Amino acid sequence: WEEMRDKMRKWREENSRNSEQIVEVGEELINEYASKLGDDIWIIYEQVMIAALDYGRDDLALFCLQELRRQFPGSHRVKRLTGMRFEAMERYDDAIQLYDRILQEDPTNTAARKRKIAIRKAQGKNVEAIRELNEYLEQFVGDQEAWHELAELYINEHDYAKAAFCLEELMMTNPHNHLYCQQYAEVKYTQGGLENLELSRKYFAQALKLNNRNMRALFGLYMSASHIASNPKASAKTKKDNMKYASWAASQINRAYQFAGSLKAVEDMLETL
Amino acid sequence: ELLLDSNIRLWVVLPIVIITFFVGMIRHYVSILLQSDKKLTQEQVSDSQVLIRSRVLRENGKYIPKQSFLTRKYYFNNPEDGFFKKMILIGGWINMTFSGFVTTKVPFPLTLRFKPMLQQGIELLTLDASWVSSASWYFLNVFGLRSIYSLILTNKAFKTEWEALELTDHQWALDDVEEELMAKDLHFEGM
Amino acid sequence: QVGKFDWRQQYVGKVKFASLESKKLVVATEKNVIAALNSRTGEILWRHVDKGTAEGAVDAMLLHGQDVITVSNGGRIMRSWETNIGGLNWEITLDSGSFQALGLVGLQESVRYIAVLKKTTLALHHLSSGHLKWVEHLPESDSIHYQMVYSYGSGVVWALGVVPFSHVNIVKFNVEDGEIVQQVRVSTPWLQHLSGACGVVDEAVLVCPDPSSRSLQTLALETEWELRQIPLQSLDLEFGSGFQPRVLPTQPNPVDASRAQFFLHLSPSHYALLQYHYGTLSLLKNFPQTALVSFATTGEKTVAAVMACRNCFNQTYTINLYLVETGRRLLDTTITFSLEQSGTRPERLYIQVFLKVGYRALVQTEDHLLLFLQQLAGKVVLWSREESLAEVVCLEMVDLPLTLGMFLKRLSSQLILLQAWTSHLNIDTLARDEFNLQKMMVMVTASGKLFGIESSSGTILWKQYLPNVKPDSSFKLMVQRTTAHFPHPPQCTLLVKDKESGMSSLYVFNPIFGKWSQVAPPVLKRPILQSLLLPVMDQDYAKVLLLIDDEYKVTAFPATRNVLRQLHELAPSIFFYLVDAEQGRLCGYRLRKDLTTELSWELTIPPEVQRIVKVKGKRSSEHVHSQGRVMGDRSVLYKSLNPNLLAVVTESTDAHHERTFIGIFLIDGVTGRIIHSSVQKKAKGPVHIVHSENWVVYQYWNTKARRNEFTVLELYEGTEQYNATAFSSLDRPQLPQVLQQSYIFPSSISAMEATITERGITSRHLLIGLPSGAILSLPKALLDPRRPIPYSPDVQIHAERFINYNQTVSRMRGIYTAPSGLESTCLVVAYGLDIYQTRVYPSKQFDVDYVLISSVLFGLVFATMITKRLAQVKLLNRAWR
Amino acid sequence: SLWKGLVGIGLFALAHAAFSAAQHRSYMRLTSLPIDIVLQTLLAFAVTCYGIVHIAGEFKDMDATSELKNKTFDTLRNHPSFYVFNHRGRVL
Amino acid sequence: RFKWAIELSYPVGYLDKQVPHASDWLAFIEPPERMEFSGGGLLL
Amino acid sequence: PPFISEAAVRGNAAVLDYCRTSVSALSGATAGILGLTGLYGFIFYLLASVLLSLLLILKAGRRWNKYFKSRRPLFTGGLIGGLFTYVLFWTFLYGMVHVY
Amino acid sequence: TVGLLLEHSFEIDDSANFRKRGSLLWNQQDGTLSLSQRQLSEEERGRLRDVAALNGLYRVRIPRRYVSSFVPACSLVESHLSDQLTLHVDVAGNVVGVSVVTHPGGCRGHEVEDVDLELFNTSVQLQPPTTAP
Amino acid sequence: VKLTTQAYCKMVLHGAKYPHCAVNGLLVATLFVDCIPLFHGTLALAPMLEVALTLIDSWCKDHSYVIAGYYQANERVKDASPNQVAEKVASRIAEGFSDTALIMVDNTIHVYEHHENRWRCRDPPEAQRISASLLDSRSYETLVDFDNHLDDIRNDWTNPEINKAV
Numbered sequence A: 001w002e003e004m005r006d007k008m009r010k011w012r013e014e015n016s017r018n019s020e021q022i023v024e025v026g027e028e029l030i031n032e033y034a035s036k037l038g039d040d041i042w043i044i045y046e047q048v049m050i051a052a053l054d055y056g057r058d059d060l061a062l063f064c065l066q067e068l069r070r071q072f073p074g075s076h077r078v079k080r081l082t083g084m085r086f087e088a089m090e091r092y093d094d095a096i097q098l099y100d101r102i103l104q105e106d107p108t109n110t111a112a113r114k115r116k117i118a119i120r121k122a123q124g125k126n127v128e129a130i131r132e133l134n135e136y137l138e139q140f141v142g143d144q145e146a147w148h149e150l151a152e153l154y155i156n157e158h159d160y161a162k163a164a165f166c167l168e169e170l171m172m173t174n175p176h177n178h179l180y181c182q183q184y185a186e187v188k189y190t191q192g193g194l195e196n197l198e199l200s201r202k203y204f205a206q207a208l209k210l211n212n213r214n215m216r217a218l219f220g221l222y223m224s225a226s227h228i229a230s231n232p233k234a235s236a237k238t239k240k241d242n243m244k245y246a247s248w249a250a251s252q253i254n255r256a257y258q259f260a261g262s263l264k265a266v267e268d269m270l271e272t273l
Numbered sequence B: 001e002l003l004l005d006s007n008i009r010l011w012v013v014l015p016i017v018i019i020t021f022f023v024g025m026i027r028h029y030v031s032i033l034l035q036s037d038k039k040l041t042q043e044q045v046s047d048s049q050v051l052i053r054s055r056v057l058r059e060n061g062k063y064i065p066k067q068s069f070l071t072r073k074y075y076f077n078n079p080e081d082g083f084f085k086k087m088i089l090i091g092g093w094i095n096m097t098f099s100g101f102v103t104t105k106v107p108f109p110l111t112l113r114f115k116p117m118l119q120q121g122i123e124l125l126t127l128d129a130s131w132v133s134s135a136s137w138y139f140l141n142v143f144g145l146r147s148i149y150s151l152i153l154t155n156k157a158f159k160t161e162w163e164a165l166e167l168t169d170h171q172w173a174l175d176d177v178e179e180e181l182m183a184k185d186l187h188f189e190g191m
Numbered sequence C: 001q002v003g004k005f006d007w008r009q010q011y012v013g014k015v016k017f018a019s020l021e022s023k024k025l026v027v028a029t030e031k032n033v034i035a036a037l038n039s040r041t042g043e044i045l046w047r048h049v050d051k052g053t054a055e056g057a058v059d060a061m062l063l064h065g066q067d068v069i070t071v072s073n074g075g076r077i078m079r080s081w082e083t084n085i086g087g088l089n090w091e092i093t094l095d096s097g098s099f100q101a102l103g104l105v106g107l108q109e110s111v112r113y114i115a116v117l118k119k120t121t122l123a124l125h126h127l128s129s130g131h132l133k134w135v136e137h138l139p140e141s142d143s144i145h146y147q148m149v150y151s152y153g154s155g156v157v158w159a160l161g162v163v164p165f166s167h168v169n170i171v172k173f174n175v176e177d178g179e180i181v182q183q184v185r186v187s188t189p190w191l192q193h194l195s196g197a198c199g200v201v202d203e204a205v206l207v208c209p210d211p212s213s214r215s216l217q218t219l220a221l222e223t224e225w226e227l228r229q230i231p232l233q234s235l236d237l238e239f240g241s242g243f244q245p246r247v248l249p250t251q252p253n254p255v256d257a258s259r260a261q262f263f264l265h266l267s268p269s270h271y272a273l274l275q276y277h278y279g280t281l282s283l284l285k286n287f288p289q290t291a292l293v294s295f296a297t298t299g300e301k302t303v304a305a306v307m308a309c310r311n312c313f314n315q316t317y318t319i320n321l322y323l324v325e326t327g328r329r330l331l332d333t334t335i336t337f338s339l340e341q342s343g344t345r346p347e348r349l350y351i352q353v354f355l356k357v358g359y360r361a362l363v364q365t366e367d368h369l370l371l372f373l374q375q376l377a378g379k380v381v382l383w384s385r386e387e388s389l390a391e392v393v394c395l396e397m398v399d400l401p402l403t404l405g406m407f408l409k410r411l412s413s414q415l416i417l418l419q420a421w422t423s424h425l426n427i428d429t430l431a432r433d434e435f436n437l438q439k440m441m442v443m444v445t446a447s448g449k450l451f452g453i454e455s456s457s458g459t460i461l462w463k464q465y466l467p468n469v470k471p472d473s474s475f476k477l478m479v480q481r482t483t484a485h486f487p488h489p490p491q492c493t494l495l496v497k498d499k500e501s502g503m504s505s506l507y508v509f510n511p512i513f514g515k516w517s518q519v520a521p522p523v524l525k526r527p528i529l530q531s532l533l534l535p536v537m538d539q540d541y542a543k544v545l546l547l548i549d550d551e552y553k554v555t556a557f558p559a560t561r562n563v564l565r566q567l568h569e570l571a572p573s574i575f576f577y578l579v580d581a582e583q584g585r586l587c588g589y590r591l592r593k594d595l596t597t598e599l600s601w602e603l604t605i606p607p608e609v610q611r612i613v614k615v616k617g618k619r620s621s622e623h624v625h626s627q628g629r630v631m632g633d634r635s636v637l638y639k640s641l642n643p644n645l646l647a648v649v650t651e652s653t654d655a656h657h658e659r660t661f662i663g664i665f666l667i668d669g670v671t672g673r674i675i676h677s678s679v680q681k682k683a684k685g686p687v688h689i690v691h692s693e694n695w696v697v698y699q700y701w702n703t704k705a706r707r708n709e710f711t712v713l714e715l716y717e718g719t720e721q722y723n724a725t726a727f728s729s730l731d732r733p734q735l736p737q738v739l740q741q742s743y744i745f746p747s748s749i750s751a752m753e754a755t756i757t758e759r760g761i762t763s764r765h766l767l768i769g770l771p772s773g774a775i776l777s778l779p780k781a782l783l784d785p786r787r788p789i790p791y792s793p794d795v796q797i798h799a800e801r802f803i804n805y806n807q808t809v810s811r812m813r814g815i816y817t818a819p820s821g822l823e824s825t826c827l828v829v830a831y832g833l834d835i836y837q838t839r840v841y842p843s844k845q846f847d848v849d850y851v852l853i854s855s856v857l858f859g860l861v862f863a864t865m866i867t868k869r870l871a872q873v874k875l876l877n878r879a880w881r
Numbered sequence D: 001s002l003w004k005g006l007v008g009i010g011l012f013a014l015a016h017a018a019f020s021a022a023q024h025r026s027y028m029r030l031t032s033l034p035i036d037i038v039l040q041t042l043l044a045f046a047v048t049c050y051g052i053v054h055i056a057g058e059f060k061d062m063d064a065t066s067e068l069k070n071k072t073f074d075t076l077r078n079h080p081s082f083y084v085f086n087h088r089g090r091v092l
Numbered sequence E: 001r002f003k004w005a006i007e008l009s010y011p012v013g014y015l016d017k018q019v020p021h022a023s024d025w026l027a028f029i030e031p032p033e034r035m036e037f038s039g040g041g042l043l044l
Numbered sequence F: 001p002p003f004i005s006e007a008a009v010r011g012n013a014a015v016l017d018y019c020r021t022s023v024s025a026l027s028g029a030t031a032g033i034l035g036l037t038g039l040y041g042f043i044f045y046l047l048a049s050v051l052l053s054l055l056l057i058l059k060a061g062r063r064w065n066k067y068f069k070s071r072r073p074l075f076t077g078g079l080i081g082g083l084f085t086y087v088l089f090w091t092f093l094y095g096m097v098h099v100y
Numbered sequence G: 001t002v003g004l005l006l007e008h009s010f011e012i013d014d015s016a017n018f019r020k021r022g023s024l025l026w027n028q029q030d031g032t033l034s035l036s037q038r039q040l041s042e043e044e045r046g047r048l049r050d051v052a053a054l055n056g057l058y059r060v061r062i063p064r065r066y067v068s069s070f071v072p073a074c075s076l077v078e079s080h081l082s083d084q085l086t087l088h089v090d091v092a093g094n095v096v097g098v099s100v101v102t103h104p105g106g107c108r109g110h111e112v113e114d115v116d117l118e119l120f121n122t123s124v125q126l127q128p129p130t131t132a133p
Numbered sequence H: 001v002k003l004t005t006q007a008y009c010k011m012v013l014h015g016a017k018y019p020h021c022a023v024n025g026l027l028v029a030t031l032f033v034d035c036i037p038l039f040h041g042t043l044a045l046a047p048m049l050e051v052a053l054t055l056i057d058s059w060c061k062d063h064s065y066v067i068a069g070y071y072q073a074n075e076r077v078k079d080a081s082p083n084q085v086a087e088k089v090a091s092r093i094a095e096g097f098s099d100t101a102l103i104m105v106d107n108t109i110h111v112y113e114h115h116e117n118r119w120r121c122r123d124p125p126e127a128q129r130i131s132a133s134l135l136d137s138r139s140y141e142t143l144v145d146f147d148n149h150l151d152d153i154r155n156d157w158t159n160p161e162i163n164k165a166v
């Protein structure tokens, strides 16, 4: 039986928003198992709400918010949940005021100003979002959940030069995860440039090393190798050793798909260059 | 060898154990009930965070490229621009209540200099110290349960950081990983 | 404890005189004591003990209806008590006399004046005051044995005298003159006394029997010539073979003449009831099977109580009344009782009489007992009082007696105990208890009466009487076995001497039930001298208890093969030491393979300047824990124990304070070498000594500062341990070193002893008996001689550690201290003419609000489980802020 | 909760052994040690040690990259505190 | 044969300027055994 | 290896301390019951520590070096804090049973 | 001054055949005690050693002007004849008793062919009684 | 411009599976007969898009099919306009076919056409209700796409099961 509470804590453990299973598996617990959970309930009223809102329902939202007010009447965190539903039903100034109250009376309440940025991100004005975000970062330098979104924003504005700064800062605080590294590679290859491309290939390989199972960075390594080996700006030594790299990667991918058990198409692609 | 009563055993031994156990637990819980907040402002928070940034940059600036490392280091060390450029009562009571007994024995021989601490109430001055008092029981259980609880439960720093960042290299450490991977083979058979 | 286990019984002794007639009576006993016992139950109102020794000996009790009268100190003193609260009313002293007799007189109808007879003079005092009234002298006063006196109230007072075998002389005096009225002198040289032979029947009479001719010499003492005579031959009234017979008259009012009728005592069991007319006898009755008889008198009526053997036989004696004037037996008033012991004879009787008739009796039987009998048919003894305990000699304290298949046995036992717990919620009925404190007492006594007591609410459980025992003898008590070899019982022993023949007797028994065991002892043929226990137990657990003859040969009671074999083996490790105080010589003998003794050492003393007083030796039933006294500087200082040591004490024959001294000697019983020979000058006082494991103490008197003092000795060998496992006294040359000191004590002393508790851990105390009856405990470590705490300036008296706060003891001839099973208490006993028992706490009872315990327990538990759910909540609400 | 029950059982057997030893000592004092009690206490000791070993916890690797072997980008992108709702779920 | 070679084109601390003894054992002692026995006294 | 979690470390150390202190207490009791002095009970504590180390080794399997860089703490572990517990439980049960 | 005999006796049956080994000389005036002996001829030595075989006794005796005492052979023969004698007396001056002890100890066993034992290496010393305060 | 049942079906299925973020897809046929859901996420990144282009180009040349269209779908419901990315994508696709179709779903269908002009509009049934019924049958949870292939090779970008479903 315990399966479901742990599978509704999993989706809280890895920020996996999949919000049709959340509600379907939660509503049962929140309705008719309150006792069983035993004061592990005041968080299931907040995970369900912030996803049942995105499903569109809007009837369970207040069913949760009212109980939360009941047990936790005076607070500044549930003020956030009151200022979210507001902006769901296109009430933005009410939300800004609801935040400004707690912010003006209790600074060091980052969530509020974060949602204030979220409003602008919603409306469309990105420059203003960026300005507000950086102004926040100055005070609270270091919040990875911020940096990654800031880089994503710089991307969405088609600027592939300053995002890499944010990622470099981001891969300096936890450099044992392939994802940040391969994404830095993906943004610096798409940036073009010889120095940029060699940096890209390097960090590609450095990423793959860690997991030894990521496929994206492997394909990236092959493509970058072929690019250099058909780029008339490099010493012959670079060209030949990159051809060797590409051949070895090709062989390894052949091993991969062999292990799997189409093949011909990818092999034609491989022998293209 | 002293033929002893059992009323002694029960009503002298056990209260000591129970009381010290539960009062240590209660002290823990009340300490958790006492700690207030000391949040003051955002300023020292920002300073601390950027200090940790500098420290990190110092220690793991060998996974990023040269130029970005150098930008950050110079910025933090740019002339004038760097951000570092501008028991008592309970013991008394219990001894007052059990003032003079002989509780139990230890199965290994003690010399005589251990005596005045184990008994601490008794004017016998003839017993081998291996026979213990009651208050020593308290003082000893104190330790035993202090070891079982673990089972059941400014500008100075600015300038130090700046100077410590002066003497620093890049040490890219990223110049041979390519061959290292390419060296032998790839490894995955666990999908 | 003050009301739980400490009791005091007090006694007065064996009566000599007494007097009955509201709810109180009076006695006077051998031990110079007066008492006012309650006539409904044994209990005292006022003891007035004065002096144990002769100088407070009583000679004549006499009361007055509400006032007692007394004479002490061989005719000197004359007191006058109250009979109600012992409050003395007056007291005087008289001149030297032999106190031949005492009386009580009046003028015509009164009781104003009293008489005396000191064999030299005669007196007449007032009574209310005590101021003398007149005195005069006897005619010749040195040759006619003035042994008696008589009044008939009114007018005058006579006075008789007679030597054994020459003649009688008679006198008569008149008040306010002291003048000798005509003094008759008639010859009757056949009588040998007149004290316990004769008596005045009616108002001028002398009467005495001559068994030769079986006749009666009679005299109307008012006016008659030559003692007219009446033969006791007309009647069948033969005398006894060699029995001195006598008269028993009566005079219930000393002012009105004596009654005519009177008893007569012919032979051990022959009495008669005569009556005297003007000149002719009238006989009423004769009794051939009487042991004892008494008179008594109410307001006007007068009776006679009589005892009889019924069928002597189960000691079932009967008591009856007869009327004196007539002889009539009374249909009612016939008591039949019986004693507990086998040979026990009354030898005494007194009477109390109501006016309803009815009566009550008092009986002082031979073996120091007192019965008070009532006529009713229920409990016939209204109270029984045991006076033999007023002189105890030696005693002892004995312990009471005791009451995969393995897995299945365990299961069964556990089940049984479960069932028991669930179900839960006199001599033959008891056994010893854990950390035993019962410790049954066995005491022996100089009148030959063995007892047994519980030591807690002392109750006599058994008794025994062993006959043919003199007043001055010598006892020794030895305990052989205690509750082992289950088919075999416990048994103790007893050795008695006789003090006149040197003979000896060995009485063996079982201390628990009081019975002489099945076996017989060897018959002691020769005078025995000494005894030791030899704690090596034979096949039957019995210690051998060897004895020494006067022919210097041995005798053992359990003389079995095994024991004799053990002796033939280990004879030469056994030694006797003997003493002779007359000439002051000690001797020491040994054993051989067979049982003989070959002299080993000897030692004398000049008996003209030194006189042995007493001898001390360590108790064999002791354990010593620490072999050393650790100095302040991590230095050991070993002590010399020498189990076989013994102390001797002496004092001079010159009693002048100028050169009077006390001597001390320490000696080894085996070899005969002196460790120490000391002398303390300017002291005479009677001594009181103690000899512990390694220390010695004695008390004495300083005649140059006329005050009491102590002196204490300790013995240390050095820093090494010579042969620290065997201690043979044949091999120690190194005579130890001595430390001593002399403190002072501000009072007198009586018997002293030391506490004890097995394993000898706790502090060791000294129990002191003062004369006032105060007991006193003193800590040994205070008397240490390693003191610079100077030479003691009046070492203190503390009236806060007195055991007997107001439960005082009279004379304190000795003390006994015995061990518990609990190691922090010692059992105490004090004899001295009033017993005492208690416990002591030398180390504050260190091995033993009740509800408050579980109260705080559960308070804490619930406060814990209440604070948990508060911490959780506050933490959670922190999370959400 | 099997192992916890096992532990409780062994421990209770040990306490029963203690009780039996106490009563045995009282009986022998009224008048050195048997076999059955010894095997029982040792049984309890060993069978408690095994269980408390199994139940205390489970070891965890100390190579972090093993944990993130399978950590897809999509789970790591969606930053909750910047969630925003103007999208097609409305139109469901 | 590069068919798809696509070319597209205050963050605090960001600038692109290419900058460079005895007693101990005493307590354990056992009381020694006695060998001789001596009893008697004062000649009853 | 180069990159460490520095949290699983503490988890593993904590579970080790748990097991060690607990079995130490248990040995103290099971010794204090059938009271034995000096050499024998020290032999007992040491033999039990060895048993513990062996059991943990069994649990890991080939030592699974990803868990532990070295087999040292398996043997040594926290061995002092167990001594106090051991003697305390000698005391407790010796007292309760082999005295009164 | 006066003289006082000193009989010394030892046999196999622990009996008494008391013979002499010389006298003591006591000066009362100042107070001093000395000895004057004769030596042990062959048969005396054989008697002493055979008595020693059985752990017999050496007995010493003097008169009251009697008194005696004893000391084993085992503790003397192997001592090369170092005995210590004391003569305890009273306050006014009267013989009280005797005390004889050998130096040192006894019964280790080493015999010396009995040719050291011809000088009686003795020590004698007396004491009045030690007074006290 | 004629769009096949399964084309619109898989199009809207993809649009609904990852709604919170923009997505794109690649159509192969003007009679469009098949779509590819390939990506879901940022989409402003070349390399994975480029290997997808190359692989799909080679595979359809093996089967001699051509690339016939692009589609993009935004997350902002009111945004139905092209950024640089779709412009370049459809530019190269037109270079390869010169008749390609660009698509933007209103999501509340805005097919464009480029003839020397910035992808202007073109002239604007049962298959609608078909797809709606499927959606309400809750089957979009088993639709795999290129990104899933790059995560787990064990997927399949031909999506044959959904094809046979209809």
Ligand SMILES: *[C@@H]1O[C@H](CO)[C@@H](O)[C@H](O)[C@H]1NC(C)=O
Pocket (backbone or CB within 6 Å): C314, C338
């Ligand atoms: C002895 O006295 C007892 C008194 O209890 C009596 O029962 C018994 O009959 C007497 N003996 C004889 C032979 O009558």
Ligand SMILES: *[C@@H]1O[C@H](CO)[C@@H](O)[C@H](O)[C@H]1NC(C)=O
Pocket (backbone or CB within 6 Å): C722, C723, C724, C726
């Ligand atoms: C003590 O006496 C025993 C008796 O056999 C002897 O063996 C031992 O040696 C003696 N002690 C010393 C120190 O000689």
Ligand SMILES: *[C@@H]1O[C@H](CO)[C@@H](O)[C@H](O)[C@H]1NC(C)=O
Pocket (backbone or CB within 6 Å): G080, G081, G082, G121, G122
């Ligand atoms: C004589 O007496 C001394 C006393 O110290 C002793 O040492 C010595 O052994 C004895 N014998 C001889 C032969 O000196």
